[PDB]
Design a binder for this molecule. Structure first.
Ligand SMILES: [Cl-]
Ligand SMILES: [Cl-]
Ligand SMILES: [Cu+2]
Ligand SMILES: [Cu+2]
Lengths: 122, 122
């Protein structure tokens, strides 16, 4: 029997080291490995990879979902360092907490353009 | 403290129903929900989301990593249903299994263009 053990989303970025710095320095993730072409970050029990792309439109259309135990707590933590004006696309930003078919959630748009959703999970 | 429980890659497709069918009908995943705009499939406890995109170039550069206990067995299971001619882009296909920077793995390119890597985990 083959068992499925875990999954790793891949964000894309035209400038990978700049996007890794956001996830690590501002959002508190840990860098696992990485160079200008491909990098991995991690936090808690989850991992994210970041792969270089030549096309900005790919990054502006990439997303991922992460389940966390307390999205409101997480949102208040990051609201100290990330803009809450999501409409302003001149930097990264985060949405308010809202409802989704999956439950409470908010999203972060990172400086590369990826949209990562942080949703309730138990 | 906030805990990070799981992560869900998002594959993209111009035709979501067709890509969902590959994953469910050909690769044996289960369908959790889905319409023409967004869908969710699952195997074991790992999940993948599939989001519609209007631009093929996004699907052609989207990717995901899934960890499994035995990539060689999994490749053999899927060899009677997925082409092994990776270079023929008229349909989905998969690579040979071999060592890579990520560990022993193979990849599948699904009909929508996404590349999903199946790697040995622990
Ligand atoms: Cl969205
Ligand atoms: Cl690749
Ligand atoms: Cu959007
Ligand atoms: Cu490639």
């Amino acid at each position: 029997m083959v068992k499925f053990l875990g999954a790793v989303p891949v964000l894309t970025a035209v400038d990978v080291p700049a996007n890794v710095s956001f996830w690590v320095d501002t959002l508190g993730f840990e860098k696992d490995f990485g160079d200008r072409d491909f990098a991995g970050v991690r936090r808690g029990d989850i991992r994210l990879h970041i792969s270089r792309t030549e096309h900005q439109i790919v990054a502006d259309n990439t997303s991922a979902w992460i389940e966390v135990t307390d999205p409101d707590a997480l949102h208040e933590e990051w609201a100290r360092a990330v803009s809450t004006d999501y409409a302003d696309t001149s930097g990264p930003a985060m949405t308010p907490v809202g409802e989704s078919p999956a439950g409470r959630e908010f999203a972060v748009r990172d400086p590369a353009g990826n949209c990562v959703h942080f949703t309730a999970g138990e």
